[PDB]
Each structure stands twice: as structure tokens, then as C-alpha cells.
């Protein structure tokens, strides 16, 4: 698929406001969701001349919340393998990215852990992060994700977005869609950008940010680290 997107952030203080505003613009409620992602790269020891592989899934919320009721406000208080989405992405007033995806449903055998399966393909673990947020469905396939992100590291977790939330606005279109449709799609994003001016600055991450080691070729992480 082809993904067009924009990113921006706000401090914790404007969260309720942005939430209310997005509810008004879309006419819909904020839907809570989370995703755990692991990034993998070709084993450097094998020297192959970089298509990173990203594995992603949802985790039940009870694994991230402790212990009354669950909603958008919760964000303020901050052996077969399982199924995983497997993605490989590659690269203009908006961000444009091509995404190749397949779904992993299960595994079996001696080395069935998702980690062994990746080593089997010649890849090694590189980075891991967790996102928790709310999303809004808007017109024309437009999707908004207001989230906080955590890098899960061997020596402890760290909220990359501490102090605020990262906002991602995107639209997925068919690969090979007309130049006119791509243009139209970009148009919807610019319209959301204007409509949200004063509330939040929507833009595409630079290249210095896009290339920093800390981002691991990941646009979302790059955007979160930018501001």
C-alpha cells in the first residue's frame, strides 16, 4: 500500500482540547488502541548490501494498565508464535511511504518463536517500542492517531513522548494510483493541516531526524523524537 501522512505533537495540557476538537471535526469518538512493534535488520555478520522488517501486533490493554473504567483519559495517567503483521517500508507536502505487508498467523517446530523465525530469514533483533493512543476515523480513509510511545529496552523502558502526545494523520491508497488521486489524497491531508492550525503544527519530519541512529529508519519514531 501507499501511505501519505503528517505528524505533530502537543503537550499534555492540550490533550483534552485536541481530543474534543477531533471529536467535533470527525463527529466520532476517540477509539483506544495500542501496538507493540519489533524492528529487525539483516544480520550484519552476514554482510548483505537496508530493508528493515517490522513485526507488529496489539496486546490486551490489561497488560499495560494496572488496578474502576477504561477510556481516552487513561492516557493522562502516564509453542506457536502469536499472530503478527510483518511490514517492510521504503520511500511532497506530505510524507509518502510504500508499505509491503503480509500476516504471520502461527508457527511450529523446534524453533518456532518469532525471534527464531526471523533469525531463520537472516534477520536480527534491532529495536522495540510500544504505542498507546486513541484513533479517529474521518472521511476519505483519513485516520488520526494521538499517541504516546515507549521504547522497550533491555535496561528499562522510556517514554519517547514524555510531556506530550504525538499525532499521526494518514491515508493509505492502492499502489499505482493515478497522479491525480495521489494529489487528491495529499489535498485531504493539507485540508486537515489548515483546519488544525493553531491547535497543532502538522508536518513531515526532517531528514536529519529521519536518519538519526535513534530512529532506526522509522518515521513514527523519528517524528516522536523530533519534538
Amino acid at each position: 500500500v501507499q501511505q501519505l501522512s503528517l505528524f505533530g505533537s502537543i503537550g499534555d495540557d492540550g490533550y483534552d482540547l485536541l481530543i474534543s476538537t477531533l471529536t467535533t471535526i470527525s463527529g466520532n469518538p476517540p477509539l483506544l488502541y495500542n501496538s507493540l512493534c519489533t524492528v529487525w535488520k539483516p544480520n550484519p555478520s552476514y554482510d548483505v548490501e537496508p530493508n528493515r522488517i517490522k513485526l507488529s501486533k496489539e496486546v490486551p490493554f490489561s497488560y499495560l494498565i494496572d488496578e474502576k473504567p477504561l477510556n481516552f483519559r487513561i492516557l493522562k495517567s502516564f509453542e506457536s508464535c502469536s499472530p503478527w503483521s510483518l511490514q517492510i517500508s521504503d520511500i511532497r507536502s506530505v510524507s509518502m511511504q510504500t508499505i509491503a505487508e503480509t500476516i504471520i498467523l502461527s508457527s511450529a517446530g523446534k524453533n518456532s518463536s518469532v525471534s527464531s523465525l526471523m533469525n531463520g530469514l537472516g534477520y536480527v533483533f534491532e529495536f522495540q517500542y510500544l504505542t498507546i493512543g486513541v484513533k479517529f476515523f474521518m472521511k476519505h480513509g483519513l485516520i488520526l492517531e494521538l499517541q504516546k510511545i515507549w521504547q522497550i529496552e533491555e535496561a528499562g523502558n522510556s517514554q519517547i513522548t514524555s510531556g506530550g502526545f504525538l499525532l499521526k494523520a494518514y491515508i493509505n491508497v492502492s499502489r499505482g494510483t493515478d497522479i491525480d488521486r495521489i494529489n487528491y489524497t495529499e489535498t485531504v491531508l493539507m485540508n486537515l493541516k489548515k483546519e488544525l492550525q493553531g491547535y497543532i503544527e502538522l508536518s513531515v519530519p526532517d531528514r536529519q531526524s529521519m536518519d538519526s541512529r535513534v530512529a532506526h529508519g522509522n518515521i513514527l519514531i523519528a517524528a516522536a523524537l523530533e519534538h
Partner: protein, 205 residues
């Protein structure tokens, strides 16, 4: 153990029809045509098995199992197989493609497809307590043999179901064939993985 694959090398395209005929009096029902793809991939990395097998089953959509070093990974690009939760949370775009398309376009620096053998217009016969699928296997150089896939409802009746088929094989003069009812890992929980593994073993890929 509820399944097995039998590959008949000493055969002609007609052995399939001869087997179906010998079985016909027991046919309760006949289902839809299906097909299957057997891909062999060779790893380019300079040592450190460099072969990986990819079985794509076409049954009301496609599923592909990857088999390497006695391990299997089940994947799909079929709409009905995508967990709805994965799409809602954005883990998936909801628009997947085949792991083979992925392998050949994004990992061709590591894995190279070297062989693709196919079975098209396979047939599916429903017998009492037994599903039997038949398909003629073809390679670049033509017909390669008959493939028989058996799936029993009850594992306890399986040996009986396989012997029955083997009996019908002797009556149509299919004298030499290889049978595989092997399990990937003697933990046997994943049927599609054992089935795919059985195709690999039966075909000696």
C-alpha cells in the same frame, strides 16, 4: 496425527482419474477445485541449511507456509484470515500480499527462488470420515507425478483410512509411492504446518 500426503512418481496424468474411479462408489460429495505451489529458495549468504521451502495452498483464498530446518511459519494475504484486531489497531494496513512477493522483492539479496512446481485443477473428494484431495504435479519439464492429500476427522481412525487408500493404489497398479505422515515437531498442534511439512517430505524437495 490426522493427515498424510502420498506422492506417486511412477504414474501418468491419468493415474489421478483411475484413483478417483476406484474410489467413486464411496464418494459422498465432491467439492471445489484447488491448487498448490511449491517454491524452493536458496540462501545467498556464504555459509555460517541454505534451502527454504514455501507451500502456497489455494482453498477459497491463499495461505503460505514457510518450512526451514524443521520449523514452519504460517502466513497469509487473504482477507478472511486477517485478525480484525490487527487491522483496528493499525498493526496491519489490512492490505497484505504474499510472503513470496515479499521474499522475492525485498529479500532477494538473501533468498533466491530457484524452483516452482505446481498442481492446478486439484480435486476434492469427501468420503466417510475422510477428505481426499488429488492433484497432478507439474514442473518446468512437465508432469511429475500424482499427489494425494488425506485428512481424517478422527486421528484414531487414520491408520485405517490410509491403509484403505493404499489398498486402492495397489488395485490400480500404482506400485511405487512415498507416504509422509510425519509431524514437524512431536507436539503436533498445527495441522497446516504438519501438512505442508508432509508435502515437503513426500516430494523430497
Amino acid at each position: 496425527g490426522k493427515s498424510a500426503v502420498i506422492f506417486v512418481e511412477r504414474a501418468t496424468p491419468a493415474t489421478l482419474t483411475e484413483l478417483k474411479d476406484a474410489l467413486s462408489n464411496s464418494i459422498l460429495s465432491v467439492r471445489d477445485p484447488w491448487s498448490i505451489d511449491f517454491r524452493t529458495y536458496r540462501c545467498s549468504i556464504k555459509n555460517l541449511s541454505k534451502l527454504m521451502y514455501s507451500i502456497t495452498f489455494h482453498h477459497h483464498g491463499r495461505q503460505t507456509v514457510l518450512i526451514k530446518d524443521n520449523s514452519a511459519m504460517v502466513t497469509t494475504a487473504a482477507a478472511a484470515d486477517i485478525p480484525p484486531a490487527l487491522v483496528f489497531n493499525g498493526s496491519s494496513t489490512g492490505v497484505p500480499e504474499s510472503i513470496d512477493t515479499i521474499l522475492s522483492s525485498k529479500l532477494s539479496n538473501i533468498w533466491m527462488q530457484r524452483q516452482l512446481i505446481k498442481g492446478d485443477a486439484g480435486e476434492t473428494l469427501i468420503l466417510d470420515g475422510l477428505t481426499v484431495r488429488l492433484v497432478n504435479l507439474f514442473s518446468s519439464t512437465g508432469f511429475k507425478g500424482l499427489l494425494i492429500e488425506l485428512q481424517a476427522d478422527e486421528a484414531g481412525e487414520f491408520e485405517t483410512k490410509i491403509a484403505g487408500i493404499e489398498g486402492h493404489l495397489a488395485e490400480i497398479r500404482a506400485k511405487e509411492y512415498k507416504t509422509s505422515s510425519d509431524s514437524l515437531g512431536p507436539d503436533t498442534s498445527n495441522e497446516i504446518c504438519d501438512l505442508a511439512y508432509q508435502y515437503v517430505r513426500a516430494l523430497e524437495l
